[PDB]
Ligand binder design. Structure first.
Ligand SMILES: NC(=O)c1ccc[n+]([C@@H]2O[C@H](COP(=O)([O-])OP(=O)(O)OC[C@H]3O[C@@H](n4cnc5c(N)ncnc54)[C@H](OP(=O)(O)O)[C@@H]3O)[C@@H](O)[C@H]2O)c1
Ligand SMILES: Oc1c(F)c(F)c(-c2c(F)c(F)c(O)c(F)c2F)c(F)c1F
Length: 316
């Protein structure tokens, strides 16, 4: 099996999960099926990925075939920032829950802190492709999301792409009902997030590492961009353990008690990515890997950088 990180709610969040961004229809269903078979219990989803209906199919299949029980699955989705207006929070969540064919979510995340123009255009933008903002804020969103927890439709709330300033704004809001259980952010040896992980952990907030393999198929990749999978120094450590680069990149987070959600639709890779509980990176190897920090992001979202709550201006 695979280990977990205990949340502030005492719920157990499986430390490896399956990413689903850009997992195509026609592949994502088989991907979820192979992952469950391979021992994955945590699946990371989102409204904006537009494939929740197929993830839902796969989960239902495995449950009705007795491969797994709902209570042993840990399903996460995210509210997109075109839906921060209160009534849209409900409508957006209802579509996610119905697509996923579930009666509750384990975690529901604010996907990004900056609000976008409210509505069903997911990427409202000007002529240059710059995001158009909305006046509803992540605090408005959180307020409405808290009702879902009151109603037992979501077990816990969290945030994604929040800086420590934005988490402080959240924690320090008077009249807060629920606290975020996780902050899902990009994290890997080129962006080690030392200060942000230290902050979150000090507040009882776990970290979920996204793009842990450096998202090698991001359509905006430039050949001069760094490549973690092909990095000779990462590959050196892999070799030392007779493991793959990807397995080292995943194990890196487990050893920092950080949840990690590599994405694949390739059955061999889905299996490979969870074969990370039979080796250990040594203290010196962990130190070497941490030294690779470049403060480099695969996910800059520069087209939203002019917005008030754009998260990446702050140091952490
Ligand atoms: N909250 C956010 O704003 C946010 C942002 C980014 C990502 N995420 C979440 O985090 C998940 C993971 O991040 P990501 O999808 O950006 O990138 P990633 O997991 O770092 O990398 C995925 C890419 O690596 C390939 N791959 C997977 N396993 C491999 C292996 N063992 N060896 C070689 N290549 C491998 C995949 O190919 P194949 O699929 O073709 O096998 C895919 O092209 C996302 O899917 C999403 O769930 C969240
Ligand atoms: O959940 C997300 C995701 F998985 C992404 F890859 C992106 C994403 C991103 F943050 C970026 F910065 C990109 O340049 C990109 F192409 C993306 F797909 C994103 F915005 C998300 F909200």
């Amino acid at each position: 099996m695979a280990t977990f990180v205990e949340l502030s709610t005492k719920a157990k969040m499986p430390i490896v999960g399956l990413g689903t961004w850009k997992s195509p229809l026609g592949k994502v269903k088989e991907a979820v099926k192979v992952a469950i078979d391979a021992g994955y219990r945590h699946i990371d989803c989102a409204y904006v990925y537009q494939n929740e209906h197929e993830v839902g199919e796969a989960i239902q299949e495995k449950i009705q075939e007795k491969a797994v029980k709902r209570e042993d699955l840990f399903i996460v989705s995210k509210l997109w920032p075109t839906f921060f207006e209160r009534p849209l929070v409900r409508k957006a969540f209802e579509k996610t829950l119905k697509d996923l064919k579930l009666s509750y979510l384990d975690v529901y995340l604010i996907h990004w802190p900056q609000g976008f123009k409210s509505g069903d255009d997911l990427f409202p933008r000007d002529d240059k492709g710059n995001a158009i903002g909305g006046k509803a804020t992540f605090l408005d969103a959180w307020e409405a999301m808290e009702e879902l927890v009151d109603e037992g439709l979501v077990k816990a709330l969290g945030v994604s792409n929040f800086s420590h300033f934005q988490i402080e704004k959240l924690l320090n809001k008077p009249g807060l009902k629920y606290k975020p259980v996780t902050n899902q952010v990009e994290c890997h040896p080129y962006l080690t997030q030392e200060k942000l992980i230290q902050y979150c952990h000090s507040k009882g907030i776990t970290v979920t590492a996204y793009s842990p393999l450096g998202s090698p198929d991001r359509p905006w990749a430039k050949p001069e961009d760094p490549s973690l999978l092909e990095d000779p120094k990462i590959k050196e450590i892999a070799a030392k353990h007779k493991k793959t680069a990807a397995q080292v990149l995943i194990r890196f987070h487990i050893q920092r008690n950080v949840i990690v959600i590599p994405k694949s639709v390739t059955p061999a890779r889905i299996v490979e990515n969870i074969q990370v509980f039979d080796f250990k990176l040594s203290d010196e190897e962990m130190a070497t890997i941490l030294s690779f920090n470049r403060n480099w992001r695969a996910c800059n979202l520069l087209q939203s950088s002019h917005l008030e709550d754009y998260p990446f201006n702050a140091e952490y």
